[PDB]
UniProtKB/Swiss-Prot annotation:
Family recorded in the similarity comment: Belongs to the papillomaviridae E2 protein family.
Organism taxonomic ancestry: Viruses, Monodnaviria, Shotokuvirae, Cossaviricota, Papovaviricetes
GO cellular component terms, A-Z: host cell nucleus
UniProt function note: Plays a role in the initiation of viral DNA replication. A dimer of E2 interacts with a dimer of E1 in order to improve specificity of E1 DNA binding activity. Once the complex recognizes and binds DNA at specific sites, the E2 dimer is removed from DNA. E2 also regulates viral transcription through binding to the E2RE response element (5'-ACCNNNNNNGGT-3') present in multiple copies in the regulatory regions of the viral genome. Activates or represses transcription depending on E2RE's position with regards to proximal promoter elements including the TATA-box.
Quaternary assembly: Binds DNA as homodimer. Interacts with protein E1; this interaction greatly increases E1 DNA-binding activity. Interacts with protein L1; this interaction enhances E2-dependent replication and transcription activation. Interacts with protein L2; this interaction inhibits E2 transcriptional activity but not DNA replication function E2. Interacts with protein E7; this interaction inhibits E7 oncogenic activity. Interacts with host TAF1; this interaction modulates E2-dependent transcriptional regulation. Interacts with host BRD4; this interaction mediates E2 transcriptional activation function.
Protein name per its UniProtKB record: Regulatory protein E2
Compartment(s): Host nucleus
Alphabetized GO MF terms: DNA binding; DNA-binding transcription factor activity; nucleotide binding
Region (Transactivation domain) residue spans: 2-196
Keywords recorded for this protein, A-Z: Activator, DNA replication, DNA-binding, Early protein, Host nucleus, Phosphoprotein, Repressor, Transcription, Transcription regulation
Source species, domain of life: Viruses
Record GO biological process: DNA replication; DNA-templated transcription; regulation of DNA replication; viral DNA genome replication
Source organism (scientific name): Human papillomavirus 11
Maturation and modification: Phosphorylated.
Length: 196
């Protein structure tokens, strides 16, 4: 290896290009994740050849490149799976398909159209937490996908699949962390509901 650096700068230049694109095409995002794998494959290689730097850039530990390459594969795979469905032609932003969002509740589900939910604990203006409720959640099933919606009640934020209600934000747990009483007020939209 020798052109490793010339190849890495071309990859990172490409990543910057993909970022700037600000595309809504799920397929560009899949290609973006493939390039993240390429970058980490090259940085991982560079660390093995003993290199410490590549044009001002610091070569990361093998464990870091291994971790990014792994996350990139997971993202790429789930996106391609979702891409084989009626949902894949919908608009998908770079943010909607990030690992960051993937790990945001509900974890390991895709989601879109987030809205704000405020919870005031005890009834003290300075005790207000903000949460997100997603209008569209895509749940995985083997290799098929299901589109569901969210709702809010005195107990928390949840999505409905059939007769099952799954909460991705528990208002009682939140209380034990930012409140002292088991009394709280919830506000989303023009709607308000208080804990009993
Ligand atoms: C301009 C610009 C400005 C800010 C950022 C970037 C670019 C990025 O690419 C960054 O996004 C992250 C990331 C980018 C891509 C992916 Cl896949 C992920 Cl998970 C995060 C991160 C990153 O690499 N996070 C990370 C932290 C710890 C580990 C690790 C593994 S084992 N021990 N530590 C690995 C990655 C970081 C980055 O690559 O520098 C980030 O914060
Ligand atoms: C398809 C595609 C392909 C590769 C990547 C993405 C998307 C990303 O979003 C990633 O960009 C990172 C980043 C990390 C920091 C910087 Cl500054 C830059 Cl440019 C890139 C990082 C990251 O932190 N992104 C991120 C996305 C959304 C939010 C957000 C905004 S409002 N709610 N959530 C925050 C972070 C990471 C990731 O988590 O996926 C990335 O490497």
């Amino acid at each position: 290896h020798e052109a490793i650096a010339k190849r890495l700068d071309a990859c990172q230049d490409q990543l910057l290009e993909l970022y700037e694109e600000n595309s809504i095409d799920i397929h560009k995002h899949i290609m973006h994740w493939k390039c993240i794998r390429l970058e980490s494959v090259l940085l991982h290689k560079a660390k093995q050849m003993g290199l410490s730097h590549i044009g001002l850039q610091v070569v990361p530990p093998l464990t870091v490149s291994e971790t990014k390459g792994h996350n990139a594969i997971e993202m790429q795979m789930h996106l391609e799976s979702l891409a084989k469905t009626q949902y894949g032609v919908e608009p998908w932003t770079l943010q909607d398909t990030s690992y960051e969002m993937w790990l945001t509740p509900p974890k390991r589900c895709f989601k879109k159209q987030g809205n704000t939910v405020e919870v005031k604990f005890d009834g003290c203006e300075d005790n207000v937490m903000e949460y997100v409720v997603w209008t569209h959640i895509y749940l995985q099933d083997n290799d098929s996908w299901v589109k569901v919606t969210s709702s809010v009640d005195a107990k928390g934020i949840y999505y409905t699949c059939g007769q099952f209600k799954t909460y991705y934000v528990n208002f009682n747990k939140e209380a034990q962390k930012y409140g002292s009483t088991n009394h709280w007020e919830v506000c989303y939209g023009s709607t308000v509901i208080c804990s009993p």
